[PDB]
Amino acid sequence: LGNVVCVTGASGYIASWLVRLLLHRGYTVKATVRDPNDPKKVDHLVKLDGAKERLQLFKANLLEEGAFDSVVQGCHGVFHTASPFYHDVKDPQAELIDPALKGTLNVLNSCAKSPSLKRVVLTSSIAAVAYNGKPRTPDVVVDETWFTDADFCAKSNLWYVVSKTLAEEAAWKFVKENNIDMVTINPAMVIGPLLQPVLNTSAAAILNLINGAQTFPNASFGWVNVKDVANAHILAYENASASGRHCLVERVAHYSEVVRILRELYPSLQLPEKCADDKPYVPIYQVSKEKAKSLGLEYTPLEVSIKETVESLKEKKFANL
């Protein structure tokens, strides 16, 4: 409750929320960022309730070997969240795969030499679970027994999913051989309220639907509320019986369905009427909520997370409606 834990990539969306919630439960949080001295990118953290007294900032370059050695020491829990945001990709190997694997093992190495460590919570992705070749249609229930076939996805140049997949496999092989207790949280598209004026890929996609787009894409993604995965990380860490992977997806929805909800929430809002290609809609499917629910997690419904996202988009000045 009032113990010491470490959160990596603290400036990230999921991480920001995790820090806010950890601070609220009384924890002392040692957070790592690229430059804790840039009062521009750590402002949203220092402002959180309790931060002034229990937010401990440390400088750490995710790709710098040993950068996390001392910060994890003295922590019973380590939440490796660190999520490098978007950028045009040339070489997937040196730009996506290599940094993915490197940063994961960099932090795990640090945890391996920490006597205080009780459990590591790794933020993974639904990308490491659902892409094994099997069809994903309305009656299909994807769950934690599904594991992405990296080789298969590579043939389709689905390099981001490949990087997330290889990184998770690497993590499980490592913790197994180095006797570390690790659990992973696996979210899909993460939306909800904003703590700073910066958007992740998912919130920007929502922004794109309300700021005058002519069409909406023909795509179906799993969607989940940022408060829910942050809470899922805390519950998976605190509950001793928690283990393995945890799917964090509250329903898969096609963009036409997302647009329908937006029309219901905002009756006078201008929204795209046309889909991007005239082809049949990418089918939706189901994703198990059992494991997260087994820890007491309650899922926020999609119409509420969309409302919160659009409301924050206005508050942070991205949208003018």
From Swiss-Prot:
Reported effect, residue 221 to A: Increase activity with sinapaldehyde as substrate. Strongly increase activity with sinapaldehyde as substrate
Keyword annotations of the record: Cytoplasm, NADP, Oxidoreductase
Binding site for (E)-coniferaldehyde: 125, 131, 136, 160, 189, 202, 221, 252, 285
Residue numbers binding NADP(+): 9-15, 34, 41, 61-62, 81-83, 160, 164, 187-190, 202
UniProt enzyme class: oxidoreductase
A Pfam family recorded for this sequence: Epimerase
InterPro entries, A to Z: Epimerase_deHydtase (IPR001509), NAD(P)-bd_dom_sf (IPR036291), NAD(P)_dehydrat-like (IPR050425)
SUPFAM superfamilies the UniProt entry points to: NAD(P)-binding Rossmann-fold domains (SSF51735)
GO molecular function, one term: oxidoreductase activity, acting on the CH-OH group of donors, NAD or NADP as acceptor
Disulphide bonds in the chain: none
GO cellular component: cytoplasm
Main location: cytoplasm
Active site, renumbered: 164
E.C. number(s) listed in UniProt: 1.2.1.44
Catalytic activity: (E)-cinnamaldehyde + NADP(+) + CoA = (E)-cinnamoyl-CoA + NADPH + H(+); (E)-coniferaldehyde + NADP(+) + CoA = (E)-feruloyl-CoA + NADPH + H(+); (E)-4-coumaraldehyde + NADP(+) + CoA = (E)-4-coumaroyl-CoA + NADPH + H(+)
This protein's pathway: Aromatic compound metabolism; phenylpropanoid biosynthesis
The protein's role, per its UniProt record: Involved in lignin biosynthesis. Regulates the monolignol composition by catalyzing the conversion of cinnamoyl-CoAs into their corresponding cinnamaldehydes. Can use coumaraldehyde and coniferaldehyde as substrates, but barely sinapaldehyde.
Protein name: Cinnamoyl-CoA reductase CAD2
